[PDB]
Amino acid sequence: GLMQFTLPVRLCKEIELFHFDIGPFENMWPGIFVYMVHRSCGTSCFELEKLCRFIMSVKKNYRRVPYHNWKHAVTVAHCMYAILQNNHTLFTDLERKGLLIACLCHDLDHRGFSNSYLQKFDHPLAALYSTSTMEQHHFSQTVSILQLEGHNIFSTLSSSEYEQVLEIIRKAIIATDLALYFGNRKQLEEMYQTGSLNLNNQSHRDRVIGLMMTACDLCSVTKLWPVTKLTANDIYAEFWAEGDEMKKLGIQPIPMMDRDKKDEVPQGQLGFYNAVAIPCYTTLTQILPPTEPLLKACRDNLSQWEKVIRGEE
Ligand SMILES: Cc1oc(-c2ccccc2)nc1CCn1ccn(-c2ccnn2-c2ccccc2)c1=O
Ligand SMILES: [Mg+2]
Ligand SMILES: [Zn+2]
């Protein structure tokens, strides 16, 4: 109870900022997450013994892949922490509980391959889950870990509160399927502009939480340039492995996954910022004004990719 987590001064200050990088010391990431739960949710939200056992089981079930790894899980949870802390009174007690856990669990047991590669491979998961294949798997893995003895961090919730929080986590994790993002943002855009957007309407909250999940998931594009640029290498390390595996199935991959087309990465990032990232943080900033620093950092990184193309870096 009286056992707080405390970070060194630089981390205590910088963790509050959207653009915080969790650093290369893996052994500090569990402490960083508990710190964020305690400040976001409270020292009472979870039994520390159960939370610590949940965290280490989640870590164990992330794989040693270039990008979709334990560091990504904690990075996405921190972006959610920053949004929740800058939007104090907008979110319920259960929502703050659910979303930090949802973010930590959102890519559980990722193999570094897209839904599309699972389908073309004819992976068993593609027969079990026809759409949002990996995301249904990520939710399935979350429930499994929650049901390990001593791992049920929600035990002190009532039956209906427990069902509500698992429903928050399920929708939050499905929403990280980027294929669903385009339509979710368009609906939120129309709702905001026509003025029909209502945060007491559960279906509306669900959409807002979905966009928050996309925003946290894409948050590598909202870091300082050197972090964004170095994270890009890990992202493309996976894309190019998938492209290799597409070639082994006798299918030319999209250029984004074809390592022979490394040259075109700068223009590819531009399209992505313009088509996905900037739209995402613009709509998020309209709905939740205090998330504007994510939009600003994203615009700064767009400007940096424009400089790469112009030969200035
Ligand atoms: C559209 C395009 O075309 C090229 C390209 C490159 C080289 C040659 C020819 C084309 N590159 C891109 C953009 C690449 N791209 C896609 C998602 N992310 C991303 C950013 C943060 N998270 N994620 C993310 C990663 C995995 C899964 C989900 C999300 C990302 O960087
Ligand atoms: Mg994912
Ligand atoms: Zn992710």
- Most ligand 1 atoms within 8 A of CB, residue of 246, 254, 265 to mutate: 265
Taking the CA of residue 217 as reference, the ligand 1 atom at the shortest distance is 22
Positions marked catalytic: 68
Ligand nearest to the CA of 238: 1
| Closest by CA position to 109, among listed 175, 59, 151 | 59
Domains of the chain: 28-310 (1.10.1300.10)
> How crowded is residue 28: how many other Cβ atoms within 10 Å of its Cβ?
16
**Which residue type sits at 74?**
V
Q: What was the structure determination method?
A: X-ray
Identity of residue 195: G
Distance between CA atoms of residues 23 and 71, nearest Å: 9
List all residues whose CB is within 6 A of at least one atom of ligand 1.
Answer: 178, 218, 220-221, 235, 255-256, 261, 264-265, 268-269, 271-272
Distance CA 109, CA 149 (A): 20
The 3-state secondary structure of the chain reads: CCCCCCCCHHHHHHCCCCCCCCCCCHHHHHHHHHHHHHHHCCCCCCCHHHHHHHHHHHHHCCCCCCCCCHHHHHHHHHHHHHHHHHCHHHCCHHHHHHHHHHHHHCCCCCCCCCHHHHHHHCCHHHHHCCCCHHHHHHHHHHHHHHCCCCCCCCCCCCHHHHHHHHHHHHHHHHCCCHHHHHHHHHHHHHHHHHCCCCCCCHHHHHHHHHHHHHHHHCHHHHCCHHHHHHHHHHHHHHHHHHHHHHHHCCCCCCHHHCHHHHHHHHHHHHHHHHHHHHHHHHHHHHHCHHHHHHHHHHHHHHHHHHHHHCCCC
Determine whether 311 is exposed, middle or buried from the number of CB atoms within 10 Å of its CB (0-12, 13-18, 19+). exposed
What number of other Cβ atoms are within 10 A of residue 138's Cβ?
A: 24
Name the residue type at position 157.
L
> One-letter amino acid identity for 229?
K
CA of 166 to the centre of ligand 1 (A): 30
Residue 279: both structure tokens together = 């739209």
User: Cα–Cα distance between 76 and 60 in angstroms, integer?
Assistant: 17
Query: Is the CB of residue 81 less than 8 Å from the CB of residue 97?
Result: no
